[PDB]
Structure 1
Amino acid sequence: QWALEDFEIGRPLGKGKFGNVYLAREKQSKFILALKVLFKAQLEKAGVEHQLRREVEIQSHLRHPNILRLYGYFHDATRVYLILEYAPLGTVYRELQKLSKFDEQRTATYITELANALSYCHSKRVIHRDIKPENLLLGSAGELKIADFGWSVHAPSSRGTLDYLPPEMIEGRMHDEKVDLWSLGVLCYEFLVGKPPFEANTYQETYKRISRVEFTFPDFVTEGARDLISRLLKHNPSQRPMLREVLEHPWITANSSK
């Protein structure tokens, strides 16, 4: 059981809607950590109150070297706070902004780790759904780490921008564990190209592109990368491979890092 007067707040790390997240230190232990505070005001004013309590509990016991740890939570009058693992090399989103694109060795590595992190998430019937670069942080070794289980869900269910969502969920419909493999294909595409495969500039253009799986590869995406991506980006879920198989796909193996 915790309170705010047990940590001292460092610099702000980033501000989204709901609340900000700061670097922080546990006053007793001198432990370095992240402190995402979420505003109980905007929580009642967005109805995600049941989604967060779900977010907390689910990650509150997922433990994996490529999943950000949630150590605990607490609330006061105006707000609630999550006390999170601190990942010292920032977001995958920002290193993509600064590099424009990644090379094969680098993306193959990210996909590997994310596959493993996902494979584990699956082994406890947890589907993430929202796997964009903005939820991927990097730890001390530049290893990828799945943050923000804001919209994760336990078991198959029927529950922003759609660039990362699969055809299943977009057109209503029921979805399973295979949604994250769509996401993984979308991610591997954005890692290599600099934009997700279905970027457009109005929501329904993008909806149509996803709906009919419409994407092209620029010339510099290799024979091996094109295969993998086309493999995961399948309208039909069950036609998408298993995380075991993608981990073993020769372009990943030839280019990943052990």
Structure 2
Amino acid sequence: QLHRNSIQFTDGYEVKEDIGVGSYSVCKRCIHKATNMEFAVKIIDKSKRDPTEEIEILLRYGQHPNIITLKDVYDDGKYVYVVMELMKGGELLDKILRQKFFSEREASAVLFTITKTVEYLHAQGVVHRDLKPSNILYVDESGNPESIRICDFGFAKQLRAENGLLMTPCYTANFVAPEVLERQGYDAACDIWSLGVLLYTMLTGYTPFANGPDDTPEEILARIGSGKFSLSGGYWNSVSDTAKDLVSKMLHVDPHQRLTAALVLRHPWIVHWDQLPQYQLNRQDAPHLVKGAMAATYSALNR
């Protein structure tokens, strides 16, 4: 169902500064010349990536408030211009980490919102397969969890049958190759590991498997081969046992014994947050450092 037409992206929009990334494509700020409104547009090179899987996901699931919403799109025959909502409130992790007053009850509300979003996607047989915090942004500076948006679904995937059919993890019979009943069960928990990395970084101000952008890829991959990230002492003293127990299983090594989004939300730190610290978090603060550390962390994975 795509695509080409008379109208061109140019005709309805003014391009602007490059706002980030990217691997197979470049996102840039733009304006809708009619209303002079601000949007963001990811320009994918068809010769390189195939937008199909991503765009579809966005059409159906964009309705989700906490999911980046798809406001428009074109294909000029060369690239594919996907207009989604521009995010003013900046990066979520980056924002939150500069908050010297932030409480567990408050970090529980953020992660709740994020996992509730991911649980939905999971029952829909869709995996992001890139959850690194740079893809979770704030549509505005309201600082309310309802401004949270998950973004850049370029690397996500639907669960399909061997027949090429939409499917849900509920339905079973209709045939999909066996390895895909595998890679979906991983890619799902793989998202849950990444959320582990967000909650760990959120309660402390450092990422569990890297100190900084300079860490060797081997050492990061090495730290991970183990797990056994430290939940005691330092910035782990004043924190809760509950959340500590939570971060452990979200970050658990076995894709299996590791938590599922659905169970996460059932963990008492998420449900029982009202029993949780309303007071700030002694946290190492190097928002720049942490960012550069995460970057070092994911490159080691994917490269």
- Normalised to the residue count of structure 1, the TM-score between the two structures is 0.77
Contact 1:102/1:192, CA 8 A, preserved across alignment: no
Structure 1: distance between partners of 2:24 and 2:101: 30
1:145 is matched with which residue?
149
Task: Indicate the SS of the match to 2:195.
Answer: helix
TM-superposed CA distance for 1:129, in Å, is 1.9
State the partner residue of 2:301: none
Instruction: Confirm whether residue 238 of structure 1 aligns to residue 252 of structure 2.
Output: no
1:206 CA displacement:
1.6
Pair 148,83 (structure 1): closer, same or farther in 2 beyond 3 Å: same
Question: Do residues 155 (structure 1) and 173 (structure 2) align?
Answer: no
Q: CA deviation at 1:194?
A: 2.1
Quote the Cα distance in structure 1 between the aligned partners of 2:159 and 2:98. Answer: 37
Residue pair 1:185, 1:229 contacting (<8 A) in 2 also: yes
Contact 1:178–1:237 at 8 Å: present in 2 too? yes
Deviations 1:206-243 (A, max 9, x none): 22222222311343332121111112222223323343
Cα distance in 2 for partners of 1:152, 1:135 equals 12
Choose which of 183, 195, 216 in structure 2 pairs with 1:202.
216
**Distance in 1 (alpha carbons) for counterparts of 2:127 and 2:255:** 14
- The alpha-carbon distance between structure 1 residues 60 and 242, as it changes in their structure 2 partners (threshold 3 A), is same
- Residue identity in the other structure for 2:153: F
Unpaired segments ≥5 residues, structure 2? 162-181, 277-303
Percent identity between matched residues is: 29
Q: Is residue 101–residue 192 contact of structure 1 (8 Å, CA) maintained in 2?
A: no
- Answer with 192-201 or 107-116: which moved more: 192-201
- TM-fit CA distance, 1:156: 8.4
Shift in Å, 1:19: 4.6
Structure with greater Cα Rg: 2
Match of 2:175 in 1: none
- Is residue 130–residue 156 contact of structure 2 (8 Å, CA) maintained in 1? yes
- The structure, 1 or 2, with the larger RCO (C-alpha pairs under 8 Å, 6+ apart) is 2
Question: Where in structure 1 are there 5+ consecutive unaligned residues?
Answer: 158-172
Question: Do the aligned residues in 2 keep the contact of 1:6 with 1:26 (CA within 8 Å)?
Answer: yes
Q: Give the aligned partner of residue 134 of structure 1.
A: 134
- TM-score with structure 2 length normalisation? 0.67
Distance 1:31 1:90, change over 3 A: same
Within the candidate set 238, 249, 252, 2:270 is matched to 252
Q: What is the RMSD computed on CA atoms of the aligned residues?
A: 3.0
Cα distance in 2 between the residues matched to 1:229 and 1:55 = 29
**How many angstroms apart in 1 are the aligned matches of 2:42 and 2:100?**
28
Distance 1:28 1:146 in 2: 27
